[PDB]
Design a protein around this ligand. Structure first.
Ligand SMILES: NC(=O)c1ccc[n+]([C@@H]2O[C@H](COP(=O)([O-])OP(=O)(O)OC[C@H]3O[C@@H](n4cnc5c(N)ncnc54)[C@H](O)[C@@H]3O)[C@@H](O)[C@H]2O)c1
Ligand SMILES: NC(=O)c1ccc[n+]([C@@H]2O[C@H](COP(=O)([O-])OP(=O)(O)OC[C@H]3O[C@@H](n4cnc5c(N)ncnc54)[C@H](O)[C@@H]3O)[C@@H](O)[C@H]2O)c1
Ligand SMILES: [Cl-]
Ligand SMILES: [Cl-]
Ligand SMILES: [Mg+2]
Lengths: 353, 361
């Protein structure tokens, strides 16, 4: 049985929800939140569980092997759930964190875990797991879609941005260390997340803000850019379930079983926010502002997560409309959190507390 | 627009030296800059034949050191890069465990970053909108068929085969492929990627599989065969690879990927038996003389794998085909080996590493 589990990037958006899921569901396991607290981390995300007996925070940078080694020595971790990553494109910082950072963690897992030479080359035992490297990644490793089709676990990688190339690289390292050294691993690739603790500059929170403040809602081209949207709480639940139930070495796609054009997303937020505030039907549609089309905005990103449901029974707990309702409710209930991010005060949390 | 300066990274290496030579001979009007850090893998003796050519220049530079690369870009304002520099000795030293990522991934990014800064990229060419016009710039990325994983009894690697790298090395190479394509898509950087089979031929280091088998046959040392020797590779003659790179560089549509193979697939046992046959015949030995050296040993995991390219696309698009069968390429390789025991001795003694200090001082 596992006694210590590291969650990297646990101060972030998705990571805080995963930290919460593991802490709540596993009181007999120490959950180590390992995080460098970049601009993207927000320890205010975990104010509710920060005084739990099985939660511990460690400020550390996965590009610094010496700092990671100190955490590995301190806790002797049985497993890593790896969410730490950089999306801002020191022009190679994102490669340092996403690729070298993943290798640094893998090297320490290879060093601290006792790997069996008999399990290399896909020969993972059906026996229960003692260790696991759980790698969280993005559906952008698969590239983009035309009008038909979906991302499957068998879809050829075709990352189209520097960020998604660096994430695709980290996926490859995990799988190659699994094959070459017998390191137990899982990889999951998920669609765009949304929900509580999303930073206010992100798409959905920004649209909520622009609607409440009667600011224009820019629509590029015809707004036909299309994404599957996954509720962050559903994502964290899937990671936990897969971590516990999936066969070693599997890949699962995780998504919300939908696909939405941006114009329809904006129109749904307008619909819910006008009704929420008792405004007339269609009140905020005058905010929609059609602008020029971005090159490649005519792209489609739609994950197929049917393998995950077929194997483990996981399914989303909300439709996108229901998830937006909870997201709007959370937004309107957390004026302070939102303002602490916008003001930059959120970063003083580690020093102040 | 006629290019004037082309960088070949890793041009002191095995494949890179042959690529330098092909570009030097075929393009007398273009300056070919051999950019190489001279690791243990590099050997400037490889280029002794062309080191005084008027369109050849050597620049000792490390692609993991942006300041050294920037100096080369400032000096030559290069129009193109043919990128072969790479590191494959994973676990070489605990003093540098991620050297393979630093060279293969970060080093590729460092080169991509300078191309993005020095080249004029048209924002209308992003998202795969490259024009059907002669290129002014090209990032030609050389990679490995191992990005595709391995094969069962049937099937071949295609350009459309999903990446499945199975080693830290091939994962780092796959990562570099992704960076090249993403810079192409995101910034409109002209690029080509090719992934090739195992290379063999002149200037191959003596510990590599085919040179070691030649040495062991010549010196009546055992030839270990793992399991049944059914490990199978497509084998590409190194000079055919360099010729393909040069042709693709000039004729392929911007943004294309090609797999380059030798139009064959050989089991290790058949490769060893072919070397035995040719070496025995070349040195006047009775047929079967060296077969007693074959030594069957315990099979090891991953030694029954199969790696083979279907190069239909390259053959259809450009008309390219190998200049030799594997048997003919082995004959040329044996001939070169026997004519170059000086080169081989200089590698084994370590003296090859003193060439730069001895000739460029
Ligand atoms: N829509 C999405 O957000 C989305 C979609 C698909 C996949 N993913 C993946 O999910 C993971 C989490 O994404 P997110 O949106 O929650 O990220 P985020 O930006 O909200 O949080 C990342 C966290 O990692 C930390 N971090 C950054 N660099 C670090 C380093 N060098 N060392 C240690 N910690 C470091 C940051 O401080 C932050 O707390 C990432 O791996 C991302 O690729 C996210
Ligand atoms: N069978 C094969 O050799 C084979 C097969 C498939 C693909 N490839 C690819 O072909 C390319 C060349 O392979 P090779 O066998 O000729 O390699 P090699 O090991 O013979 O040569 C590599 C060269 O790169 C140089 N180099 C290494 N690190 C460097 C750095 N940081 N900065 C600058 N120069 C550096 C070395 O000094 C050397 O001259 C590689 O990209 C490899 O992935 C090779
Ligand atoms: Cl839009
Ligand atoms: Cl063998
Ligand atoms: Mg299905």
């Amino acid at each position: 049985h596992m006694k210590n589990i590291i969650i990297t990037g646990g101060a972030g958006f998705i990571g805080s929800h995963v930290v919460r899921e593991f802490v709540i569901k596993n009181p007999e396991i120490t959950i180590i939140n390992l995080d460098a607290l970049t601009y993207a981390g927000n320890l205010e995300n975990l104010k509710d569980i920060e005084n739990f007996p099985n939660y511990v925070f460690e400020k550390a940078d996965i590009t610094k092997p010496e700092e990671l080694r100190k955490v590995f020595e301190k806790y002797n971790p049985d497993a890593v759930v790896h969410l730490a990553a950089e999306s801002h494109v020191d022009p190679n910082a994102f490669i340092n964190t996403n690729v070298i950072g993943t290798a640094n963690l893998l090297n320490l897992c290879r060093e601290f875990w006792t790997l069996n030479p008999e399990h290399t080359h896909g020969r993972f035992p059906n026996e229960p797991r003692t260790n696991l490297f759980y790698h969280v990644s993005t559906d952008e490793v698969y590239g983009s879609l035309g009008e038909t089709g979906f991302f499957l676990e068998t879809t050829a990688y075709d990352p189209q941005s520097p960020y998604s190339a660096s994430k695709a690289a980290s996926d490859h390292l995990v799988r190659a260390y699994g094959n070459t050294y017998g390191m137990p691993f899982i990889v999951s690739n998920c669609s765009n997340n949304y929900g509580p603790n999303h930073f206010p500059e992100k798409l959905i929170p920004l649209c909520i803000s622009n609607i409440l403040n009667e600011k224009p809602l820019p629509i590029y081209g015809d707004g036909k850019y299309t994404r599957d949207w996954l509720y962050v709480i559903d994502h964290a639940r899937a990671i936990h379930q897969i971590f516990n139930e999936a066969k070693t070495g599997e890949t699962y796609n995780i998504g919300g079983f939908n696909e939405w054009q941006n114009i329809d997303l904006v129109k749904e937020l307008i619909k819910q926010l006008d009704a929420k505030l008792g405004k007339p039907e269609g009140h905020s549609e005058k905010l929609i502002t059609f602008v020029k089309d971005r090159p490649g905005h005519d792209k489609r990103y739609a994950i197929d997560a049917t393998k995950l449901n077929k194997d483990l029974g996981w399914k989303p707990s909300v439709t996108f409309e229901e998830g937006l309702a909870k997201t709007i409710d959370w937004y309107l209930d957390n004026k302070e959190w939102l303002e602490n991010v916008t003001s930059g005060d959120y970063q003083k949390y580690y020093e102040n507390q």
